[PDB]
Design a protein around this ligand. Structure first.
Ligand SMILES: Nc1nc2c(ncn2[C@@H]2O[C@H](COP(=O)(O)OP(=O)(O)O)[C@@H](O)[C@H]2O)c(=O)[nH]1
Ligand SMILES: [Mg+2]
Length: 167
């Protein structure tokens, strides 16, 4: 019943920062008398209970066996680059292609996210990102995990993309 969200993107673009900001404003306690202490934390976004995972590619995760499993399990993907990191934007296509290959699907719920939009150093223009998202047929939004600009909108939009996909 839960929606399975996966955050992907290059090291250091802000995947964890965004996900922490999302959890901070969306966690709730849920009464469940079948578990120890009778209460569990859940994340609820736009009325849906959501599971959250970050696909990390660096540090300990460089040696991981789990990359394809994250892509098979996830139902929708936040594809994150940073607006001050041209290489992170160039990396997006590979992430999208891998997800499509692993899921063997042309239609995978996805949102393109340009994070760190609070920073004054910009090397990825809004138009470059919007043209890429239009080619993919997916939404594009700029976010800042520092100021919270766009964070809720990015996750809410992904939940709606997954809801339309589930039909
Ligand atoms: N200025 C600014 N810094 C950010 C933003 N998001 C993340 N950071 C910083 O960028 C660094 C990498 O963030 P992190 O969440 O670890 O990235 P991850 O490797 O993609 O999970 C950290 O120092 C964060 O504080 C943002 O929107 N604006
Ligand atoms: Mg292993």
């Amino acid at each position: 019943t839960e929606y399975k969200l996966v955050v992907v993107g290059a090291d250091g673009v802000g995947k964890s920062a965004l996900t922490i900001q999302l959890i901070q404003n969306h966690f709730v306690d849920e009464y469940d008398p079948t578990i120890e202490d009778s209460y569990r934390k859940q994340v609820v976004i736009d009325g849906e209970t959501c599971l959250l995972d970050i696909l990390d590619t660096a540090g300990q995760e460089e040696y991981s066996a789990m990359r394809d499993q994250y892509m098979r399990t996830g139902e929708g993907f936040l594809c994150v680059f940073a607006i001050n990191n041209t290489k992170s934007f160039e990396d997006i296509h590979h992430y999208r292609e891998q997800i499509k290959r692993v899921k063997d699907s042309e239609d995978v719920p996805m949102v393109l996210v340009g994070n760190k939009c609070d920073l004054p150093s910009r090397t990825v223009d809004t138009k470059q990102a919007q043209d890429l998202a239009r080619s993919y047929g997916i939404p594009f939004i700029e976010t800042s995990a520092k100021t919270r600009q766009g964070v809720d909108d990015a996750f809410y939009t992904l939940v709606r993309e997954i809801r339309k996909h589930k039909e």
